[PDB]
Symmetry: D2
Subunit: 320 residues, 4 copies
């Protein structure tokens, strides 16, 4: 008969629903950077890629499949039809162009929610705070399961810059950027430390214009990292990729590690409208379970409630 | 200074350094795969295109929290690649419309005349891994220019081919590529040789169990599996405009064997004057032992009369272009 | 207010139902080598340890929990009570004491407890003798055969590949060879399938695996047979190699890789065997356990050695009382 | 013809000089947990085990060899003779005198010195450029012993020190706050075990000082008993020892973490035992755990933790104890 029947005796009926499936929505350079990083970390037993361009979608899929000998993710599937994204534990949304973006998500999210009703939603698209609200509003998901990339990578970048100055690895440099991704993010100088030693105690001018070492510019460097990498190679892909696989690892492995990620905050940090900002969140198999209450100066508190107003303003005028 | 109030100093030649030459989609696929397997305590990128380079380096630098490669450096000047144990060549020129095979190789030779001498001066004990196509010739080119011994110049050759073969073999048998064994040897491209005899799952010859395997008669058209591999790049470039991921994984796989001195057997491009009836200085892919000193040993596959003939004709063709190169 | 409620705002009461749980039964040297190998390969979100010696159990559990900072397995539980093993994807049996009958007595308690708390789990038997006691767990459990696996010749083949690699000067990864049938004195070295890069060493060297071979390759399978015995007479027991080889099966199962392992499956109706026995053949291991068996072409001497193993096993299993 | 000669054509006469070699001295339960965790993190191209029990050593070596298929460390060797350890980058010392019943603390220390008199010069002979990582207890004392006998500069002698005490402490923090230990920070410093100094000021999640949220944290009043969390660490070993007779897994994991920082040149901050004469107001040649920057050259820099006048007393107290004990030792 067929070679396969000569070689192999089948004694079971492929009753296969995947146990540890990640979907990456959108195969721009960000999405494919999240894909390659997720694949190389052995996080998922099935990876699904979905996008509007059928040729490019298939290209990426085929390429990843060609690497199957060097990976430990046995099934990699793609399609325009969101049926391929079914029984995903985690769906990473990386697609967009703002009201237009909403309208993009009104196709994506009802489809993601149909086929993976119990999934976690990781929104990476910009503007990430509003698009995490849109993802949440449209999905009907409880806030624990709608997560925004937020300032996760901004904090990773901050810790790198801290690292190169102090001449120690980023893993041993602790620092938090919170609130609205980009220009309005608050660098929490009180929390910055190495081996638990407050850098604000040793250098009290830390976080002021007057400061000789200009540590305030290290936060300027963070918000202007994306623009400076886009000016040089046309986009960013690798850092966001490794950061999103970090969030994915905490979720799939249920690690309950603390990440500065965008969460539905109303009722905390003095914020009394439905918005999403970065605060340190305990991340595990049911998404965001718990938020750390960071002690903020009244200036840091004001700055966070200003951001919340800016977001509620824009969010009020969006049509659903 | 904060650095000095917080840290007391009490006390820089890198021991496990890799350079990727060229920050095309390939070299970056190689770079991320290397970082994400912790093969290197230092990564250097080099490319003629200055902005893109800085930009790419910076994009990896920002991922440092999530890595265990503590130093990422770039530059157009090759001083940044000093004391690399492995140097991976991905920079080249793509074939233009109407361009002959000799004119393409020649153009790349002119590029390698700048790249290679610069690599040897700052890293004179490194192994060279040439990915740049056409890889069998461009590996010869890098060998002759470097003046390195042969053990230390390696082409990626039929590594990715054999990998895509083991994938396709596994989608057909319903087992993982890791459990499907098959070797594509000789010249990378349409002249690839698929060694049907050595194809096994669990050490069971699929050629003994199904003698049609490889022939036109075969009702399962296994000959079109060797064609699917030949046409893999074609099919991916048609859909997404280039290939990146798979070659990366493949190169990082060779990097591991070298950096960690595994002495694993890979199908890769070595100078095999004096083996498989080849009498001149050419690079064909045969199963090579890959360790910290590069290619140290070669497995001798029993080939059919047909198969050692395919390798002689490729060796005749490669020499035919090679003798006509102005170095 | 309590520091915890000062630092952390609870957003979600959550049900604690584990998603990728592994149980190791027995915390002897073998079971803890399995535990540490599984922990360091990141195959589980929860590891349970069960054994009769509550002190040993709690100590081993605490010693692992103290490494949590260095691991990505966020929950390690332990107990005499099999309640801790609830909702294991995979339960690995390392516990055991007519010597056969005493391991059956033990299995008649252990296996029903595993089944009560994990009706849907795969069973990976390791205790010796492993082909018989896989059979015992299959009979006692009432599980389908695809979900009852024995570690079988997975380690023998690995040792064989290391030994092969030392004589050729290549890594064991690039040395292929299969040891099949009964684990131990009666294991079958399949000379035909021994290869580097698809070159049949038996074709290359026809005297390979026969008495009149000056390279003495038949004495290399006797090293694999004798390996345990020699390491036991040197350090008291074997642990590291079995532990790594068991994690390897764990990885295939938990990641659904569908790789081929020489593991012990219920073989009635394959390889000319007509009784209910477990023997090692190349098995496709995935998330539903053994989905498929590779039909290996055997010499008549090999077919016979296997059928003879099936008779001595079935004969030992006839005399057992469940 | 020979099967090797038929199959494989040699192109390159190969003399192995290893580039990433780690030696573990002592194949007690601790040596072997260091060995397996090092092997399973792919940190060495060669591993060498060494001990005095010839049977035990060869047997362990083989068990590891027999799982080479599941590893990425091609060369695993062993021997009584220390020549097997040449060209190690890192020699982890886990060996020590066996406890005789009815023996003084001092006679025990002094038997461990006589053992290090045999071990250390044999290590330095064959691997003269290696970093030493001393694990054997007492760890602060024997790290000094190893520094003095070796005559290596302080940057290349590390003690395991309070590294695992900190990791134990972070596990315990984790269980109380219901967060992973990676996300709970606290440092245990000074002398390893009973005299360990817990640095309350430094303890946090997400850079939020726990001492600030809860000012009684550390004091005896504090009704949440956080001081008992420090005693839980000091005592952790003692309780694991009563239950299973020894500790092996945690220290193995924690030693491997230090090896990684050395072998990958990470420059990560670890609470390890360094020779701190000149730092922290310490005036004599003793080893105490401070947050050290660990890399290919060993300990390169030390972080200067702002200590309370009390915590500063405890360190000095430990430095007099240690200097006191070291004076009475026969080198």
């Amino acid at each position: 008969a067929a070679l396969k029947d000569q070689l192999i005796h089948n004694l079971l009926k492929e009753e296969h629903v995947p146990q540890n499936k990640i979907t990456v929505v959108g195969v721009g350079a960000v999405g494919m950077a999240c894909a390659i990083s997720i694949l190389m970390k052995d996080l998922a037993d099935e990876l699904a890629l979905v996008d509007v361009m059928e040729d490019k979608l298939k290209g990426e899929m085929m390429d990843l499949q060609h690497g199957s000998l060097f990976l430990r993710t046995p099934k990699i599937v793609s399609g325009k039809d969101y049926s391929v994204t079914a029984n995903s534990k985690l769906v990473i949304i990386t697609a967009g162009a703002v009201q237009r973006n909403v309208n993009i998500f009104k196709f994506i999210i009802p489809n993601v929610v149909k086929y993976s009703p119990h999934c976690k939603l990781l929104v990476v698209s910009n503007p990430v705070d509003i698009l995490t609200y849109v993802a949440w509003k449209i999905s009907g998901f409880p806030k624990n399961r709608v997560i925004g990339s937020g300032c996760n990578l901004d904090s990773a970048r901050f810790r790198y810059l801290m690292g190169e100055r102090l001449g120690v690895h980023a893993l041993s440099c602790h620092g938090w950027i919170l609130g609205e991704h980009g220009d309005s993010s608050v660098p929490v100088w009180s929390g910055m430390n190495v081996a638990g030693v407050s850098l604000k105690t040793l250098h009290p001018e830390l976080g002021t214009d007057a400061d000789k070492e200009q540590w305030k510019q290290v936060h300027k460097q963070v918000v202007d990292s994306a623009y400076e990498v886009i000016k040089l190679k046309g986009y960013t892909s690798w850092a966001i990729g490794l950061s999103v696989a970090d969030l994915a690892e905490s979720i799939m492995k249920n690690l309950r590690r603390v990440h500065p990620i965008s969460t539905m905050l109303k009722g905390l940090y003095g914020i009394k409208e439905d918005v999403f900002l970065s605060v340190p969140c305990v991340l595990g198999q049911n998404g965001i379970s718990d938020v750390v209450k960071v002690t903020l100066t009244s200036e840091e508190e004001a700055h966070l409630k200003k951001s919340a107003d800016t977001l509620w303003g824009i969010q009020k005028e969006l049509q659903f």
